[PDB]
Design an enzyme around this catalytic site. Sequence first.
Site, PDB file in Angstrom:
ATOM      1  N   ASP A 173       1.222  -0.971  -0.235  1.00 12.65           N
ATOM      2  CA  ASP A 173       0.343  -0.107   0.000  1.00 12.65           C
ATOM      3  C   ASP A 173       1.095   1.236  -0.120  1.00 12.65           C
ATOM      4  O   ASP A 173       0.917   2.132  -1.260  1.00 12.65           O
ATOM      5  CB  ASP A 173      -1.459   0.295   0.714  1.00 12.65           C
ATOM      6  CG  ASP A 173      -2.434  -1.200   1.238  1.00 12.65           C
ATOM      7  OD1 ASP A 173      -1.327  -1.859  -0.024  1.00 12.65           O
ATOM      8  OD2 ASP A 173      -3.334  -0.783   1.874  1.00 12.65           O
ATOM      9  N   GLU A 177      -1.433 -10.175  10.206  1.00 14.23           N
ATOM     10  CA  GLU A 177      -1.641  -9.758   9.494  1.00 14.23           C
ATOM     11  C   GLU A 177       0.242  -9.172   9.289  1.00 14.23           C
ATOM     12  O   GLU A 177       0.911  -9.512   7.384  1.00 14.23           O
ATOM     13  CB  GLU A 177      -1.648  -8.016   9.116  1.00 14.23           C
ATOM     14  CG  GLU A 177      -1.710  -7.908   7.830  1.00 14.23           C
ATOM     15  CD  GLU A 177      -3.175  -6.641   8.037  1.00 14.23           C
ATOM     16  OE1 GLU A 177      -3.909  -6.396   8.981  1.00 14.23           O
ATOM     17  OE2 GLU A 177      -3.068  -6.117   6.297  1.00 14.23           O
TER      18      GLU A 177
HETATM   19  C1  LIG Z   1     -11.950  -3.815  16.507  1.00 13.11           C
HETATM   20  C2  LIG Z   1     -11.267  -3.639  14.368  1.00 13.11           C
HETATM   21  N1  LIG Z   1     -11.946  -3.582  13.485  1.00 13.11           N
HETATM   22  C3  LIG Z   1     -10.241  -3.941  12.754  1.00 13.11           C
HETATM   23  C4  LIG Z   1     -10.730  -3.470  11.459  1.00 13.11           C
HETATM   24  C5  LIG Z   1      -9.269  -3.181  10.207  1.00 13.11           C
HETATM   25  C6  LIG Z   1      -9.938  -3.112   9.137  1.00 13.11           C
HETATM   26  C7  LIG Z   1     -11.125  -3.315   8.282  1.00 13.11           C
HETATM   27  N2  LIG Z   1     -10.978  -3.301   6.737  1.00 13.11           N
HETATM   28  C8  LIG Z   1      -9.813  -3.118   6.247  1.00 13.11           C
HETATM   29  C9  LIG Z   1      -9.638  -3.714   4.756  1.00 13.11           C
HETATM   30  C10 LIG Z   1      -8.535  -3.361   3.480  1.00 13.11           C
HETATM   31  C11 LIG Z   1      -8.037  -4.776   3.672  1.00 13.11           C
HETATM   32  C12 LIG Z   1      -6.629  -4.327   2.935  1.00 13.11           C
HETATM   33  C13 LIG Z   1      -5.512  -6.316   3.871  1.00 13.11           C
HETATM   34  N3  LIG Z   1      -4.101  -6.324   3.202  1.00 13.11           N
HETATM   35  C14 LIG Z   1      -4.188  -5.512   2.651  1.00 13.11           C
HETATM   36  C15 LIG Z   1      -2.793  -5.253   2.285  1.00 13.11           C
HETATM   37  O1  LIG Z   1      -1.919  -3.911   1.460  1.00 13.11           O
HETATM   38  C16 LIG Z   1      -2.912  -5.779   0.971  1.00 13.11           C
HETATM   39  O2  LIG Z   1      -2.026  -6.350   0.321  1.00 13.11           O
HETATM   40  C17 LIG Z   1      -4.118  -7.008   0.852  1.00 13.11           C
HETATM   41  O3  LIG Z   1      -4.421  -7.010  -0.840  1.00 13.11           O
HETATM   42  C18 LIG Z   1      -4.846  -6.571   1.586  1.00 13.11           C
HETATM   43  C19 LIG Z   1      -6.011  -8.110   1.796  1.00 13.11           C
HETATM   44  O4  LIG Z   1      -5.253  -9.263   2.413  1.00 13.11           O
HETATM   45  C20 LIG Z   1     -12.239  -3.502   9.077  1.00 13.11           C
HETATM   46  N4  LIG Z   1     -13.656  -3.683   8.521  1.00 13.11           N
HETATM   47  O5  LIG Z   1     -13.575  -2.570   7.029  1.00 13.11           O
HETATM   48  O6  LIG Z   1     -14.048  -4.143   9.254  1.00 13.11           O
HETATM   49  C21 LIG Z   1     -11.963  -3.011  10.875  1.00 13.11           C
HETATM   50  N5  LIG Z   1      -9.432  -3.477  13.749  1.00 13.11           N
HETATM   51  O7  LIG Z   1      -9.831  -3.496  14.488  1.00 13.11           O
END
Ligand SMILES: Cc1nc(-c2ccc(NCCCCCCN3C[C@H](O)[C@@H](O)[C@H](O)[C@H]3CO)c([N+](=O)[O-])c2)no1
Length: 767
Positions: free
Chosen positions: A540, A737
Amino acid sequence: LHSEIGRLNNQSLLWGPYRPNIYFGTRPRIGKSLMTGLMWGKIESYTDFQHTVRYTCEQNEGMKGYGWDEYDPRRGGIQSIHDIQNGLDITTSFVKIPGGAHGGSWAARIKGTLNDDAPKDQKTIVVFYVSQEGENSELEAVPSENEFGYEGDVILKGRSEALGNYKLVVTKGKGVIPQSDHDLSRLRGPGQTVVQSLTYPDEVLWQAKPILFQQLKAGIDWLVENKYDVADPPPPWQVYLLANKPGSGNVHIVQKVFEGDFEFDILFSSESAGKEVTSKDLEREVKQATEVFGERFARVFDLKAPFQGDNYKKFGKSMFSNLIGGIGYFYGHSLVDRSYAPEYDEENEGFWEDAAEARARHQEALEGPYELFTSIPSRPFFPRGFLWDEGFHLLPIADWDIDLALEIIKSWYNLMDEDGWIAREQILGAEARSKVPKEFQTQYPHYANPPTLFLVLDNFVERLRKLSLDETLSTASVDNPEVGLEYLRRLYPLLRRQFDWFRKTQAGDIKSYDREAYSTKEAYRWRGRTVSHCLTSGLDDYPRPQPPHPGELHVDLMSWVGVMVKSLISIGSLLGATEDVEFYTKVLDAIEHNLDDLHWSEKEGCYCDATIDEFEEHKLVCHKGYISLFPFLTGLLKPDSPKLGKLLALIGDESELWSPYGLRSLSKKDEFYGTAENYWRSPVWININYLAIVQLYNIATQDGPYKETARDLYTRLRKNIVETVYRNWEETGFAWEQYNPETGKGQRTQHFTGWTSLVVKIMSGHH
Ligand SMILES: Cc1nc(-c2ccc(NCCCCCCN3C[C@H](O)[C@@H](O)[C@H](O)[C@H]3CO)c([N+](=O)[O-])c2)no1
């Protein structure tokens, strides 16, 4: 015979607990059909159950952890849930029983054990929610004999074109059922299993929590209207027990209240299969699946030293089971901007502002419906298909079950449009959308993502070149070469289409600048870059040329194109596409020279992305980290390459990339180390470390000048990565992660299984 193995695969994989966005539920691989889901929560007051009830996956202080202990989508598995808020340790065992013509039968046992902290007389509400989508289908709860509810089992009889006739039984189960001595019991009964059968328009049946609550609220309003009040109120658990009203409908709510420990079974009996499924069938099939799970693991994931110990095996089984256990079936419309606005070509300086303007026209609209059968990164936070993640997910899965992996690849490639585009993030249907802010739903046809699915294909190819029905099916596409070849024959044009799409849409500019290079063609730039980000690359916020510029070239992207050409060489060859293979050969040769001519920094001793200066000249922009290693990570360098040896030095260098915990995404020496959100600017990521480990091993097991350096680095990195992921799992119960290179701690999101699970294949080795 390819047709035959295909139908057998279809029949084998049809049913599953393919709803990983929720704690426990089932659905078949049919868009509009029968779905189930589990809810539970303690009730201690008149207002708490709305806050305690569990349904969709989350992870916070109220939940110790949860996940699959064993899983195989052909057989079933066992999930463990450790719920602090509800003082409950829960087990959900699921098992499939082949037979009939409709994808077989299945059963589940739900067991809840109060933990030591819970009050021994806790009341827990449990709901089994059942819905069926489709115009010409039917589902009916058979009424009980008793007046107010069910003393015994609840039987649902239903039918559809896809499933034929079936029955779904929710057994009486075991545990104390509380009894109310209140006046209300005269009209509501003293306390018993109840069923409400309802209908809603198909498209909203997924909204199980609101639908249930609407019924609870109607019951409470009835209490109010009928003079049940605060002078003499019924107990909470009775206030929250639905009036029994079974019938026909497309929604069926089955509710039980228990005091103390409980268990009950769900038995799905496919009528075309003959003898119906019993609880004794369930127990037997559960014991058998574990035995088979056990035997396959020891063969497929045989952990090598120093990880042969039982603690590592348990670790490996949890990491693997959670990965393959995340497999879901998703169905519905997706949100896509099909304007192809010219601003999206990013041809001018300052293109990001133009692209923002086009997005602000909001031309995106729903399209499809589409379906997808895929594993996912994150049950609690993003339970849906991501394109380059899935390349990593399938490497351990293919080991387990190559035919399953091929099914998933096929499912992904069936999304590809006429141009060669597959959306990097698949949000299919209102259920999936519910998890995603509307601002982040829209997909863009000019946004690529790394083609890591080709890595899986590469492994299949090598396997193709060199028992129960389930065991047989799992390898049919390798054991029967003609089957394997046909699969490639049919997939091959879509791979080629994607290749062409990369070169048409993600092309960089040589010819318009002072740029000299062996090839005038081979140059790439990721579309979709903002001042601070390059989301499409997958890394990212890894630092990139500033400012972004139409003259940028990205070395990772060119390396990916190299991965793709090599795969197309191998597959082309297998299919005798002679003319194609000659073209591929020329492209590979060109990428090889151009990686050097456009991306190699002699001064820095690594690869760098490139831009165009204020003075209109080509400039390398070096930020030592993952990006820097890319031709190495993607298997593009020769074992004797001086450039390789310099990359090995960078990799091994403690003061740059090498932490005790794995390789740092970015060097400690880089000006951007640990800045901003610090996502890809220092932390240890398992997926890239896995590519490093595999490439080190390649060099280590081959004659050349770096054999011994590679062997030492392989040994150490493998150990470092495994141990970090293991220590964290031991301490926290979670896969994370990314990992902190200073402390070794897991950080960002938990339940990342998710490419962190690659650790199983790292342990088992022998690449
Ligand atoms: C409590 C508590 N809740 C949360 C919480 C944290 C994040 C989220 N959504 C983020 C969506 C983005 C996905 C990207 C991940 N990853 C990034 C890499 O950079 C890519 O390469 C790769 O492709 C993608 C896929 O692996 C949500 N939520 O939307 O429900 C809730 N934390 O703590």
